[PDB]
Design a protein around this nucleic acid. Structure first.
Ligand SMILES: [Mg+2]
Ligand SMILES: [Mg+2]
Lengths: 136, 141, 176, 94, 44
RNA sequence: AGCCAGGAUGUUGGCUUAGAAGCAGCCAUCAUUUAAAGAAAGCGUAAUAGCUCACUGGUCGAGUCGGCCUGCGCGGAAGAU
């Protein structure tokens, strides 16, 4: 499960998820899986989706993961009074804005990359689309 | 040729002419009198040899039993006796289970100018080899 | 559409009355009558029947393409007539003809009877062979569902009433 | 070898360009050499398909603008953030 | 027959599948092998 | 898309080979008579088996196919006087 090894601080203001994405072209492979909807990816979701593509391609083809949790999510457990301090870190998320290239792939034919990245889309909480390397 | 009246083939290398444990009923469940297996087979298979596995045809008539005709040994069984290992494939092209050659093969392919679909001497040289290749073979003529 | 573009032939004997959207086509074996959908144009003259659309009705080509396959079948039925074929399979199964009543004994405590509709009559050669003869095609398939629905084909012994164009696939009696 | 038909822009800034894309067109620009930049407006569907063959990004294209001809090369491109379209393109009078 | 709200996996299992409309919903017949029979929906 | 049939051979491909012949397996993915034809996707299990099938040929005669930019609507959609 991906997670920052260390961070300066345990806990983080909620913040927002405004604006558009920076990762919008396929920058390492030949094909890519791109985020369309807006939202937060948990580390467990990213791992479940990463598995789907690796099942499908055997031990062939290389995969890059362009997003990284980085943001800690806290929660107060059951039966707790409000106030009394910020929750305990339970899992880690990455903030995703539309256009972020999430996954890339190269080493399989385009037809198989679409199938392989697709057997992943059912694991993600935001709509996605298949994108390709582009000249310039 | 003509239409089907049940003719296939069920047996291994000529170690038994009429065997109980090997095939069983499956060769005499139709009209095959298990007696002709040795009373026709020996009555005729003491003419080429009684030691390579040969697949034959089967002809059952409304009268008594059947007459089968043989013709050529299988291409794959030929490799166990004089080409490589004891059984054949097993672990094919992972390692290099041998080095036969086009020469050893041809003498048991050209001699099949009727039961070996092919009006080309050359074809048999590589066609019989087609059977002999999956067992991981480097051809070194 | 492509059905619709090919008109229908009317040989001799045929009658063709076209009161707007009512049709009566008669020949040597009936007086078949049908109310035509509004959104259609079966035209006359020549020796044909073109099936086109009418301006102001949406579908139209699906509607006039249906009249093609309908009047097509009608013209055949008033000349040559239609014949289905239910062959009986499954022991203790009777079939005999007492006029226009079909005698069925298909394993039940009560021999089922079936009264035949208008022009769809029928008969039997034996106790396992039924053969119907009629004019309408919408009705012979209908009689064939009634006669067939009584005892449907069980898929383990292929028993019951079956079409003669019928494929009775079977499966194995479980395992162990 | 590809020839693009363009009209000169009468406005500029975010409003017109979002209005252009709202009008199924999109802006682009021609700069380079000694002469001044040339603000242009393009038909969207035509250039999307052109640039879908690598030849677009390495050949000298011809822009036809008010029935004249400016020889340029594609230099940079802004693509839609996540849809298959285009927001803007740079051409250089090279 | 099962329901499910997604016929993308129904229409490919056996070749004899085609998808029709029928009533308000969207059914997936197979009178060839009646095992592969899907519906898409509830009622009122 | 219908439909005529063809869909023949190396070949039980050898194979941990209980029958494994495509056909519950191990792997391999050759090359044969060619308009075609896999050591084979499937009904199947005593095993061929049988027929559709992947592929072409004869026929049919002006269109077929479904992905983009999108407007609108269908399924998903069960609670208690
Ligand atoms: Mg504003
Ligand atoms: Mg209803």
């Amino acid at each position: 499960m991906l997670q920052p090894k260390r961070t300066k601080f345990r806990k983080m203001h909620k913040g927002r998820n405004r604006g558009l994405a920076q990762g919008t072209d396929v920058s390492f492979g030949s094909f890519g899986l791109k985020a369309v909807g807006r939202g937060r990816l948990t580390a467990r979701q990213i791992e479940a989706a990463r598995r789907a593509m690796t099942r499908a391609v055997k031990r062939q083809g290389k995969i890059w993961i362009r997003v990284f949790p980085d943001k800690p999510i806290t929660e107060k457990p059951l039966a707790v009074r409000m106030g009394k301090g910020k929750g305990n870190v339970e899992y880690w998320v990455a903030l995703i804005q539309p256009g972020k290239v999430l996954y890339e792939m190269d080493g399989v034919p385009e037809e198989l990359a679409r199938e392989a990245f697709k057997l992943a889309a059912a694991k993600l909480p935001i709509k996605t689309t298949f994108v390709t390397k582009t000249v310039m | 040729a003509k239409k089907v009246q049940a003719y296939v083939k069920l047996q291994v290398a000529a170690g038994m002419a009429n065997p109980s444990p090997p095939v069983g009923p499956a060769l005499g469940q139709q009209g095959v009198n298990i007696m002709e297996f040795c009373k026709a087979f020996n009555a005729k298979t003491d003419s080429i040899e009684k030691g390579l596995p040969i697949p034959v045809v089967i002809t059952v008539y409304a009268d008594r039993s059947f007459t089968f005709v043989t013709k050529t040994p299988p291409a794959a069984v030929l490799l166990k006796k004089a080409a490589g290992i004891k059984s054949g494939s097993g672990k094919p092209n992972k390692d290099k289970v041998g080095k036969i050659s086009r020469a050893q093969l041809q003498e048991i392919a050209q001699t099949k100018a009727a039961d070996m679909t092919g009006a080309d001497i050359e074809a048999m040289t590589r066609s019989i080899e087609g059977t002999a290749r999956s067992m991981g073979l480097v051809v070194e003529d | 559409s492509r059905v619709a573009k090919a008109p229908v032939v009317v040989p001799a004997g045929v009658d063709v009355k076209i009161n707007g959207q009512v049709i009566t086509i008669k020949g040597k074996n009936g007086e078949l009558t049908r109310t035509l959908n509004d959104a259609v144009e079966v035209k006359h003259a020549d020796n044909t029947l073109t099936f086109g659309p009418r301006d102001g009705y949406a579908d139209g080509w699906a509607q006039a393409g249906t009249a093609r396959a309908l009047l097509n079948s009608m013209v055949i039925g008033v000349t040559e007539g239609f014949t289905k074929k239910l062959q009986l399979v499954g022991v203790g199964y009777r079939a005999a003809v007492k006029g226009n009543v079909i005698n069925l004994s298909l394993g039940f405590s009560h021999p089922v009877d079936h009264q035949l509709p208008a022009g769809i009559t029928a008969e039997c050669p034996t106790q396992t062979e039924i053969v119907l003869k009629g004019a309408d095609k919408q009705v012979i398939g209908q009689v064939a569902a009634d006669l067939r629905a009584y005892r449907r084909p069980e898929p383990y012994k292929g028993k019951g009433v079956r079409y003669a164009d019928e494929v009775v696939r079977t499966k194995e009696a479980k395992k162990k | 070898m590809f020839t693009i038909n363009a009209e000169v822009r009468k406005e500029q800034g975010k409003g017109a360009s979002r209005r252009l894309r709202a009008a199924n067109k999109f802006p682009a620009i021609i700069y380079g050499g000694k002469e001044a930049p040339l603000a242009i407006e393009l038909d969207h569907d035509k250039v999307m398909n052109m640039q879908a063959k690598a030849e677009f990004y390495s050949e000298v294209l011809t822009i036809v603008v008010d029935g004249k001809e400016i020889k340029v090369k594609a230099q940079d491109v802004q693509r839609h953030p996540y849809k298959p379209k285009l927001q803007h393109i740079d051409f250089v009078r090279a | 027959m099962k329901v499910l709200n997604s016929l993308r996996t129904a229409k490919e299992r056996h070749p004899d599948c085609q998808i029709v409309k029928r009533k308000g919903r969207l059914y997936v017949i197979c009178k060839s092998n009646p095992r592969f029979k899907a519906v898409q929906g509830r009622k009122k």
